[PDB]
From a paper:
To target disease-causing proteins that are inaccessible to small-molecule or antibody therapies, we are exploring the use of a nature-inspired drug modality that exploits the intrinsically favorable properties of synthetically constrained α-helical polypeptides (Helicons).
We selected the ECD of the transmembrane protein PD-L1, which binds to the ECD of Programmed cell death protein 1 (PD-1) to suppress T cell function, and which has not, to our knowledge, been shown to bind α-helices. We have also structurally characterized two other Helicons, FP28135 and FP28136 derived from the same PD-L1-binding phage cluster, and observed a similar assembly. This revealed an extensive series of contacts between both the two Helicon protomers and the two PD-L1 protomers. Taken together, these findings demonstrate the ability to discover multiple α-helix binding sites to a relatively small ECD that was not previously known to have any, as well as the ability of Helicons to induce protein dimerization.
Numbering used by the authors:
A (entry chain B): 1 to 17
B (entry chain A): 18 to 133
Write the structure that this text describes.
Amino acid sequence: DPALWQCVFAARYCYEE
Amino acid sequence: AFTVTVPKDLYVVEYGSNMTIECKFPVEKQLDLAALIVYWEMEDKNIIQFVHGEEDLKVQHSSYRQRARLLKDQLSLGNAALQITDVKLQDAGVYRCMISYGGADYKRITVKVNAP
Ligand SMILES: *CC(=O)Nc1ccc(NC(=O)C*)cc1
């Protein structure tokens, strides 16, 4: 679950920056 | 088991004000900061990534940079409190705190933004 959340937080960071 | 609570589930705030939205989580005695993970998200924007006792601001969505931060000193009380200063119309939407502290849980909060 924190794994999944960090998976998504990192995926969006790639998209934004 | 591990439950995260929200005092209210809907916040209506005026444009240009500061808002503080809160999530509560269970803390037995002191606080194991190694154990604590906090994530705040709204819509598709990364607001706050706090994990294993450390902040991460590079992941934060650019619209919240220096405008949004997690209020730490309440965490030792079991409160993950996201404050956003100078609320914009685009701060309206659905927010979600995600807390891991041994167990893990999350809640959703809706924000409505006025204008005057
Ligand atoms: C599970 C997971 O963390 N996946 C993941 C993390 C980060 C990225 N980052 C980029 O692509 C830059 C991809 C996938």
